[PDB]
Amino acid sequence: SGFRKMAFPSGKVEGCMVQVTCGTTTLNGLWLDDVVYCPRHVICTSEDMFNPNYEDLLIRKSNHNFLVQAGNVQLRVIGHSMQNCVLKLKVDTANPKTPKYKFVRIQPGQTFSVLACYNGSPSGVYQCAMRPNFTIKGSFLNGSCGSVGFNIDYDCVSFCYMHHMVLPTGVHAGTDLEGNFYGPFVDRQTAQAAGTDTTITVNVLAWLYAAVINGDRWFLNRFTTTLNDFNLVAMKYNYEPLTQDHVDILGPLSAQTGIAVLDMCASLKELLQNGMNGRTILGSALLEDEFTPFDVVRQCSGVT
Amino acid sequence: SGFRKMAFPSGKVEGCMVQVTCGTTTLNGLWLDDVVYCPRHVICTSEDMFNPNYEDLLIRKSNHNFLVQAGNVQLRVIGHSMQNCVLKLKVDTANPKTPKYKFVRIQPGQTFSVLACYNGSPSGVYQCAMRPNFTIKGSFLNGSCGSVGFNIDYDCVSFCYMHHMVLPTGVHAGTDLEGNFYGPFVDRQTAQAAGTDTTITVNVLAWLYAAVINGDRWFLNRFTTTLNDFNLVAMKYNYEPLTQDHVDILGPLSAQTGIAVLDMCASLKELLQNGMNGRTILGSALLEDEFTPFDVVRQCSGVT
Ligand SMILES: Cn1cnc(Cn2c(=O)nc(Nc3cc4cn(C)nc4cc3Cl)n(Cc3cc(F)c(F)cc3F)c2=O)n1
Numbered sequence: 001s002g003f004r005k006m007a008f009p010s011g012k013v014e015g016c017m018v019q020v021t022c023g024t025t026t027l028n029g030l031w032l033d034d035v036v037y038c039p040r041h042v043i044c045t046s047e048d049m050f051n052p053n054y055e056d057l058l059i060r061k062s063n064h065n066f067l068v069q070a071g072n073v074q075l076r077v078i079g080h081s082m083q084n085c086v087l088k089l090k091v092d093t094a095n096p097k098t099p100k101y102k103f104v105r106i107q108p109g110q111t112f113s114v115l116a117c118y119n120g121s122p123s124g125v126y127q128c129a130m131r132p133n134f135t136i137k138g139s140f141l142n143g144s145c146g147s148v149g150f151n152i153d154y155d156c157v158s159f160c161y162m163h164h165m166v167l168p169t170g171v172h173a174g175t176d177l178e179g180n181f182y183g184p185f186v187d188r189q190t191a192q193a194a195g196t197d198t199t200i201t202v203n204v205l206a207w208l209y210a211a212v213i214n215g216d217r218w219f220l221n222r223f224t225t226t227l228n229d230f231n232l233v234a235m236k237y238n239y240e241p242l243t244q245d246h247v248d249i250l251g252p253l254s255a256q257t258g259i260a261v262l263d264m265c266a267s268l269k270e271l272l273q274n275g276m277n278g279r280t281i282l283g284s285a286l287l288e289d290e291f292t293p294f295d296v297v298r299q300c301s302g303v304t
Numbered sequence: 305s306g307f308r309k310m311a312f313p314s315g316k317v318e319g320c321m322v323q324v325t326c327g328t329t330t331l332n333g334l335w336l337d338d339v340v341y342c343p344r345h346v347i348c349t350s351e352d353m354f355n356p357n358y359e360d361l362l363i364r365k366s367n368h369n370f371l372v373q374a375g376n377v378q379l380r381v382i383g384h385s386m387q388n389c390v391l392k393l394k395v396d397t398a399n400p401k402t403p404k405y406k407f408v409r410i411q412p413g414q415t416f417s418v419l420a421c422y423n424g425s426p427s428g429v430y431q432c433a434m435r436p437n438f439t440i441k442g443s444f445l446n447g448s449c450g451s452v453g454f455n456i457d458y459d460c461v462s463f464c465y466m467h468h469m470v471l472p473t474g475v476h477a478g479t480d481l482e483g484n485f486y487g488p489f490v491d492r493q494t495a496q497a498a499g500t501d502t503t504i505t506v507n508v509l510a511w512l513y514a515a516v517i518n519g520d521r522w523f524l525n526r527f528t529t530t531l532n533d534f535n536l537v538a539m540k541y542n543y544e545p546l547t548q549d550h551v552d553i554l555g556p557l558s559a560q561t562g563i564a565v566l567d568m569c570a571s572l573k574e575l576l577q578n579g580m581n582g583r584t585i586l587g588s589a590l591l592e593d594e595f596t597p598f599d600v601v602r603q604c605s606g607v608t
């Protein structure tokens with residue numbers, strides 16, 4: 001009962017966060033086994049940030065230029081290498097708190113938990129989604145560079161995001177853990193613009209199901225639509241088109257609830273055209289698109 | 305930049321969660337030093353839950369009736385005692401992962417993070433507020449009894465909530481860690497009703513400040529009101545009355561923003577009377593009342 005923006009427990013990640021300083025530039029890094037992963041922007045002095053030549057800056061550095069602090073313990077840098085936009089600092093000590101992990105790239109519309117960190121120190125946890133324009137609507141202040149996003153699958157942490165920068169619109173941009181940006185951005189301190197964002201339709205439908213599971217039923221009706229008639233309406237309102245694979249993903253919720261996907265699509269059509277008229281769904285007055293079908297199952301049926 | 309429902313990192317609590325079984329009844333408990341704290345409802349068999357006589361049930365038990373599992377490790381119960389609605393199971397091993405901690409009772413309107421647990425296993429983290437009617441709007445399934453709420457002050461975990469039960473309306477009720485209920489509830493499986501809830505006015509004002517800090521300014525105006533004129537309007541709309549101490553708490557946000565509290569109160573007056581007319585604030589179409597003034601400072605200025 002109830003429905004909240006729920007993050008994954010963050011303890012397994014917290015013991016991996018460290019602080020990385022290179023001269024007067026400092027940010028967060030991720031310590032797994034005997035490697036520390038962090039944004040390569042850390043080798044920039046303030047003069048280099050606008051237009052860095054990262055290959056040039058890196059060859060001018062040595063291992064002792066890199067200060068890595070894990071709490072009070074200092075870690076000895078014994079090697080360094082660049083992989084796309086991340087720096088890999090080999091250290092002399094393997095992190096005894098290394099969880100089982102993997103590096104995965106997520107798709108637009110998927111959700112993950114962020115551990116926001118400052119000076120190597122975990123500060124807070126929240127859930128967000130990768131937007132279709134490859135930015136996230138995070139909550140980050142100065143000093144959060146290197147903070148990570150992750151999911152938990154049983155025992156295993158899947159890292160999927162490393163925070164790099166803020167865009168002029170206030171949204172955030174970053175890379176996967178192999179250093180490849182999400183979206184068309186580059187790691188330099190310039191004004192870069194995001195493409196126009198759209199609403200994640202399958203998620204809105206997942207959330208309507210969650211509402212029906214929690215006793216909000218006022219928006220349902222008899223009608224059924226077809227994919228094509230729906231998608232014609234979706235596009236007018238800046239919603240991602242719906243596919244057959246989307247419909248199939250919503251299968252478990254369809255079953256548990258007794259409402260066909262195309263049945264629920266007709267309700268969504270109505271909500272889009274007529275609005276909500278001061279009514280709320282799951283305590284919201286807007287259609288919420290940052291819960292996936294898996295988030296709903298996890299919170300309305302049970303997974304630990 | 306950005307604004308999210310942010311929870312505290314949960315790692316320090318996660319290593320304290322255990323599973324407590326007494327016959328066929330099972331729930332979560334909190335292992336600190338050599339004590340395990342859990343809801344006393346665990347000594348009820350299914351027949352006892354409607355109208356337990358807890359003093360009777362407890363004397364009929366012995367230490368070996370209590371199965372406590374910390375992951376795979378079983379803990380040896382060497383003593384038991386009841387304190388109001390919580391059971392204290394003394395065990396033979398002190399939890400090596402015990403953080404610095406304290407037990408504090410929170411006031412209505414304050415916020416805290418919940419670690420929702422099942423079978424002793426941490427499942428998710430979210431932030432919520434204690435409502436003025438002493439319930440919380442949580443997200444909990446069967447098996448979450450004993451889950452805890454907490455805050456973090458530097459190094460120190462302040463535990464403030466132990467989850468007991470769900471009410472017919474879908475909201476949740478629990479105790480502090482000394483076993484005293486929040487609100488007029490009792491730990492038995494009967495239908496109990498909550499008092500009528502109200503909106504936490506000081507929090508709504510804290511959130512309007514957060515919006516101004518993040519560039520949402522459309523709702524501001526010239527007018528100033530007085531406490532008395534505002535409180536006259538607040539009460540018509542089921543808002544908690546505002547006090548001088550509330551005004552003082554909003555001091556830091558007033559300063560950082562250049563907008564007097566009574567200035568912001570006039571905007572809130574307008575929003576209450578005219579509504580928002582399809583505009584949003586911080587991505588919400590409702591006035592949000594579950595961020596305290598301290599939550600806003602923490603997320604818009606910086607505290608780790
Ligand atoms: C407001 N906000 C929201 N998210 C962010 C993230 N972020 C950040 O934390 N820091 C950045 N630049 C740095 C300045 C430094 C000054 N010192 C002493 N050390 C510093 C280290 C960093 Cl990383 N930036 C900007 C930024 C970071 C990049 F990694 C990048 F490739 C381009 C950029 F423009 C930043 O966005 N701040």
Ligand SMILES: Cn1cnc(Cn2c(=O)nc(Nc3cc4cn(C)nc4cc3Cl)n(Cc3cc(F)c(F)cc3F)c2=O)n1
Pocket residue numbers: 001328329330331343345346444445446447448449468469470476490491492493494
């Ligand atoms: C849907 N929901 C939302 N929150 C809750 C919390 N909660 C819970 O998890 N369990 C409860 N009763 C139990 C049944 C058991 C069956 N077995 C085998 N073991 C059990 C243990 C418990 Cl605790 N309840 C009900 C409940 C729990 C109390 F602690 C109480 F004092 C009165 C109550 F009515 C419950 O609300 N479920």
